[PDB]
RNA sequence: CGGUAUCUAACCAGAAAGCCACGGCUAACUACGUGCCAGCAGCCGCGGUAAUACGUAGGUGGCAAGCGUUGUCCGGAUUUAUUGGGCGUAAAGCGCGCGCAGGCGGUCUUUUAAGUCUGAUGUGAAAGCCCCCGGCUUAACCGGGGAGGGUCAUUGGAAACUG
RNA sequence: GGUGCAUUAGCUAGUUGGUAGGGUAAUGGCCUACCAAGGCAACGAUGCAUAGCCGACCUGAGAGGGUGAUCGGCCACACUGG
């Protein structure tokens, strides 16, 4: 566009969007409003657990969960590691990171921070899955 | 020192004669590990300019975090960016101890200084990172002058570099003039280092 | 010459350069005069002649080629366009092709190439690049 | 002594009593593309005798505040 | 007295009436450090024999580059195909700053300091074409003086 | 009520002061009218530098120095001079 | 603060290393267990009984009192393109005219100096980035000196180009 | 001189100017009585939403883009309103 056609209306860039929208909200219990902050993790409580089937072409069975966050939003998260000890209505710590296979789930539970215990028998790559040093 | 591991793997994996010549690559020059004695794979250019970055800091055995800081400090110095960083990194008093022969190796010189065995201009200095400038004096503090190791390490005395002056009668030394790259080891290129950090 | 008779003038040189022509003529003006004389001072033009006419006269320009069929004027670019005028301060007059090229400046003391405008410490509108 | 700022401009209206509004149209390099854009803001002056007429060119000077907005006084009617 | 270096090896295939048949195409660039460089293409059924056929092509497209003060004289842009690359001189000792297959021609040519940037497409066959086009517009100081009837001092 | 005073700069347990003029109401190291000189108490023969001309015109304008600053000028030999212009 | 900094003298290698990764991007490979299960995943995608991609073990690579994961911002992104993009077929020329405001405007001469360029004066605090020296056993840090930073103001000049 | 929204087009009635007087440290519709009907806005008035401002900090080759914590200057507030 010519310069004059560029001074009547300027160039406005795009607006890139967040990929983890439930980790950048906040609830003010006094006024009942959704604050706009940022936060690496949020605490939540479980509503229902279980398993889901992966999308094509993968054909395993994956352990998922549905959690109600501190800001009152209910979403679905993924349980990593080999097995879990997650009963219904337990406090968990959630974090970002999607999984390609399962369609709906976007968040990703931390292992070892809360009710979720450390994965059993991890000899390497142990900083994740939260298991102490086998002294 | 700072890396307290076996002294030969790093020298031969690196494809050079680290810390002198031929002591560690004399026999079984295959690269370390279960493999390495099998075959060599053509190194991608990223490997070319990374391993040769390793051929510098591994030569002096200093942790990386200050390899930047010396490199960054060397950038402000006028001249050629790659060459000066080699020059400045040669001014550490470990070399100035190792070059004079007061220590058999480099890592011994670091262990020598850290226990405060030397004094620059007659004052004790405790750290290997001090850089010495032209016209300074390096003595041995006249405390452990009769220790067997130091006199023994002066017996080899392969070839004292031109750009330093020394005598064992009074155990003194100095830096006559700024070295000139060629006077260094300079067996490695310097351009493949500057490229790596200008990524 | 609808809007810019200097932008047109540069183009008329470049078009006839591409096809390896030798002579070209075009209507004359006071500003077109010395801009055609400057190019003679650096050999970019073999020579220039003026013609008197009834309306305003024309100017005939003899374009120059080096032997072995190599062109001499390899391009032209305009900077002060009528839609967007540009002015350059004394210290910020650029050098074209690290001094191999030439730029034209209409300083306060007549049209001048920046070889001496920087030497005379003046600035003004920047007319064109030649390289 | 120190002098107040003195401007020029063109008369725009006189429907207000004993005061006139004059525009001062000047150029200004744009923010980013560097294109001169006609920028014009209009002040309010003072006329003791209402001599100045619409469409005239004058020179006005800053002064003490005199009304809610009136803070310039006329110096001379440059032309009609 | 040249120092050929390989750039990319593809694996192309054409479909026949019974199935598919594969062949290998390799791009190599050849030069000596003086300033003479060239590039060539090849195609064969076996990769070791694809490279050898490629070099003999490249030895026919030698080109020269001006190297005043161990650096290109002035900035220039090469604009072949969908790939555009600009080259501009660097300060002494900086080193060659270039993409993947555009430093390859520069290292072989024998230039020590130069900057660059590949503003066009990223197909390696078109980067080498653009760069070779880039250097044609690159002139020594005296050649310009010969054409314009001047000498060196007034130009610089 | 402009008073000559000091201004604490430097690392902990290594003070380095400035001879600076200021209004009495403003903070210790906040706004200041004009800097005069430094004063280093680390070295045994103290390091003192002052304008010795600008302060003279300030004192004729009504600045009363601080207790320790008053000692610095005397040991500097410049308080005696101010005793010699007031007779004029 | 505080018998804090520091110095001196005696004793013992003894009391002091972990985290991530190893198919490509990307530096770094084998054996066993499992067999579209358990599982990994930043993208390509790995697993259906001979896995350099799952789990463990040996070895190697990276970095180091730290190493990884998540979150926010800039870059690569010429992916809002003034410097620095386009519209036949890839998204992109309104269905087409008459036209207000606006934007731009053939050749020459004289004049004005709003734009334009330039000289001087004042001012743009201190700390901060940069540069030059000096102090902390070195560095971090801390000092002194300068430079820059304005579509800044007053005043004097130039008249080629725009008005 | 420095923010978005036009899926936000008109706003203002002490308003805009004038004659006297009142009130303050001071000029002033700051206020009063009277006179006239003006003043602002597509060069974004009005309304809505968001936000303390700057020296500076992070990034970038540069132009630019994001932020205004600690340190310094200016402003506003002190449980909410007068
Ligand atoms: Mg450290
Ligand atoms: Mg006056
Ligand atoms: Mg594995
Ligand atoms: Mg961009
Ligand atoms: Mg179609
Ligand atoms: Mg289409
Ligand atoms: Mg049409
Ligand atoms: Mg300052
Ligand atoms: Mg607020
Ligand atoms: Mg960029």
CA dist A56 and A58 (Å) reads: 5
Q: Stated in angstroms, how far is A2 CA from H1 C1'?
A: 26
CA dist C19 and C12 (Å) reads: 11
d(CA E96, nearest CA chain B) in Å:
8
Q: Stated in angstroms, how far is C13 CA from G97 C1'?
A: 38
Place of tokens 């041995």: B140
CA B46 to chain centre: 24
CA dist F30 and E139 (Å) reads: 61
Which residue of chain A has the CA closest to D30? A7
Q: Which nucleotides in chain H lie closer than 7 A to a protein CB?
A: 1-2, 5, 15-19, 27-30, 36-41, 43, 64, 72-74
CA dist A27 and A30 (Å) reads: 9
Test C72 with E137 for CB contact under 8 angstroms.
no
Q: Render A58-99 in DSSP notation, one character per residue.
A: ----EEEEEEEETTS-EEEEE--SS-----SS-EEEEE----
The residues of A between 105 and 124 with beta carbon within 7 Å of nucleic strand G are: 121-124
Q: Render E20-40 in DSSP notation, one character per residue.
A: EEEEEEEEEEEEETTTEEEEE
Q: Is the CB of A95 under 7 A from strand G?
A: yes
Q: If 0-12 CB within 10 Å is exposed, 13-18 middle and 19+ buried, where does residue E79 land?
A: middle
CA dist A25 and E59 (Å) reads: 65
Q: Stated in angstroms, how far is A57 CA from G49 C1'?
A: 21
Strands E63-64 and E76-80: unpaired
DSSP three-state, residue A121:
coil
CA dist B14 and B7 (Å) reads: 12
Six-digit token string for A17: 């969007």
The answer to whether F15 and F24 are in contact (CB under 8 A) is no
CA separation, residue C4 to residues C32, C78, C86, C108, C127 (Å): 12, 11, 15, 21, 12
Q: What share of chain D is helix, strand, coil (3-state, %, to 5)?
A: 0, 45, 55
Nearest by Cα to E58 from E118, E108, E121, E119: E108
The answer to whether E148 and C74 are in contact (CB under 8 A) is no
Six-digit token string for A51: 């398993």
For residue C63, give the H/E element and its range. strand C58-63
Distance in Å from the first CA to the final CA of chain A:
69
Strands B119-120 and A107-109: unpaired
CA dist B49 and E88 (Å) reads: 23
CA dist A12 and A6 (Å) reads: 11
Q: Which nucleotide is nearest to D65 (CA to C1')?
A: H27
The answer to whether C37 and C47 are in contact (CB under 8 A) is no
CA dist C125 and C112 (Å) reads: 11
Which residue of chain B has the CA closest to E99? B199
Total Cβ atoms within 10 A of residue C121? 10
Q: Is the peptide bond before A57 cis (omega within 30 degrees of 0)?
A: yes
Residues of D whose CB is below 8 A from C86: 34
The answer to whether E40 and E55 are in contact (CB under 8 A) is yes
CA dist B172 and F64 (Å) reads: 58
Q: Is the peptide bond before E104 cis (omega within 30 degrees of 0)?
A: no
CA dist F62 and C27 (Å) reads: 79
Six-digit token string for B147: 């220790």
Q: Where are the alpha helices (DSSP H) in E24-120?
A: 47-58, 100-109
Test E95 with B82 for CB contact under 8 angstroms.
yes
Q: Which nucleotide is nearest to A108 (CA to C1')?
A: G70
CA dist B138 and B165 (Å) reads: 10
Name the experiment that determined this structure.
cryo-EM
């Amino acid at each position: 566009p010519t310069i004059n056609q560029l001074v009547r209306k300027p160039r406005q860039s795009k607006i890139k969007k967040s990929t983890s929208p439930a980790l950048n909200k906040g609830l003010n219990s006094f006024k009942r409003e959704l604050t706009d902050v940022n936060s690496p993790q949020k605490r939540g409580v479980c509503t229902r657990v279980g398993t889901m089937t992966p999308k094509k072409p993968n054909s395993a069975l994956r352990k998922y969960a549905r959690v109600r966050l501190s800001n009152g939003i209910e979403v679905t998260a993924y349980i990593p590691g080999i097995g879990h000890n997650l009963q219904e209505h337990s406090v968990v710590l959630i974090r970002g990171g999607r999984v390609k296979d399962l369609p709906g789930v976007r968040y990703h539970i931390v292992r070892g921070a809360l009710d979720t215990a450390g994965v059993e028998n991890r000899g390497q790559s142990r900083s994740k899955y939260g298991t102490k040093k086998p002294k | 020192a700072r890396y307290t591991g076996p002294s030969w793997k790093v020298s031969r994996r690196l494809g050079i004669s680290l810390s002198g010549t031929g002591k560690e690559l004399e026999r079984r020059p295959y690269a370390p590990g279960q493999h390495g004695p099998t075959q060599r794979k053509k190194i991608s250019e990223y490997g070319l300019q990374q391993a040769e970055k390793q051929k510098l800091r591994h030569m002096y055995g200093l942790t990386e975090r200050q390899f930047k800081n010396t490199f960054n400090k060397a950038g402000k110095l006028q001249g050629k960016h790659g060459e000066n960083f080699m020059i400045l990194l040669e001014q550490r008093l470990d070399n100035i101890v190792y070059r004079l022969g007061l220590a058999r190796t480099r890592r011994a010189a670091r262990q020598l200084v850290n226990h405060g065995h030397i004094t620059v201009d007659g004052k004790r200095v405790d750290i290997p990172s001090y850089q010495v400038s032209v016209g300074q004096v390096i003595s041995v503090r006249e405390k452990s002058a009769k220790n067997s190791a130091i006199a023994e390490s002066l017996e080899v005395s392969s070839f004292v570099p031109e750009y330093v002056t020394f005598d064992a009668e009074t155990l003194t030394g100095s830096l006559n003039r700024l070295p000139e790259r060629s006077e260094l080891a300079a067996e490695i290129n310097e351009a493949f280092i500057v490229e790596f950090y200008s990524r | 010459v609808m809007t810019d008779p200097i932008a047109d003038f540069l183009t008329r040189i470049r078009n006839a350069n591409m096809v390896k022509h030798d002579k070209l003529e075009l209507p004359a003006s006071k500003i077109k005069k010395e801009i055609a004389e400057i190019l003679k001072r650096e050999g970019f033009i073999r020579d220039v002649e003026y013609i008197e006419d009834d309306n305003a006269g024309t100017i005939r320009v003899f374009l120059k080629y080096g032997a072995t069929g190599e062109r001499v004027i390899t391009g032209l670019k305009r900077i002060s366009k009528p839609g967007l005028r540009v002015y350059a301060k004394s210290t910020e007059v650029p050098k074209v092709l690290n001094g191999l090229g030439i730029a034209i400046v209409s300083t306060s003391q007549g049209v001048l190439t920046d070889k001496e405008a920087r030497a005379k410490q003046v600035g003004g509108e920047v007319l064109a690049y030649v390289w | 002594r120190n002098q107040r700022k003195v401007y020029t401009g063109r008369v725009v209206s006189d429907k207000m009593d004993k005061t006139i509004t004059v525009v001062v149209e000047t150029y200004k390099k744009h923010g980013l593309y560097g294109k001169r854009v006609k920028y014009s803001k209009k002040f309010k002056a003072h006329d003791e005798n209402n001599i100045a007429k619409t469409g005239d060119v004058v020179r006005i000077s800053e002064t003490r505040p005199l009304s809610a907005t009136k803070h310039f006084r006329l110096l001379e009617v440059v032309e009609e | 007295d040249l120092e050929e270096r390989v750039v990319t090896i593809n694996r192309v295939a054409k479909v026949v009436k019974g199935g598919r048949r594969f062949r290998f195409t390799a791009l190599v660039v050849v030069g000596d450090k003086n300033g003479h460089v060239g590039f060539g293409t090849g195609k064969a059924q076996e990769v070791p024999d694809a490279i050898r056929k490629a070099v003999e092509d490249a030895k026919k497209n030698m080109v020269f580059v001006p190297t005043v003060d161990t650096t290109i004289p002035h900035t220039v842009v090469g604009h072949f195909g969908g790939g555009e690359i600009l080259l501009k001189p660097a300060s002494a000792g900086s080193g060659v700053t270039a993409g993947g297959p555009v430093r390859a021609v520069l290292e072989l040519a024998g230039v020590a300091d130069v900057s660059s940037k590949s503003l066009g497409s990223n197909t390696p066959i078109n980067m080498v074409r653009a760069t070779i086009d880039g250097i044609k517009q690159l002139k020594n100081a005296e050649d310009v003086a010969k054409l314009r009837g001047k000498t060196v001092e007034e130009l610089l | 009520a402009v008073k000559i005073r000091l201004k604490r700069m430097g690392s902990k347990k290594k003070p380095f002061y400035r001879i600076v003029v200021a209004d009495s109401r403003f903070p210790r190291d906040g706004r200041s009218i004009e800097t005069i000189g430094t004063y280093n108490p680390l070295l045994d023969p103290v390091e003192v530098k002052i304008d010795e001309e600008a302060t003279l015109k300030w004192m004729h304008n009504g600045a009363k120095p601080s207790d320790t600053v008053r000692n610095l000028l005397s040991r500097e030999g410049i308080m005696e001079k101010f005793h010699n212009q007031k007779l004029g």
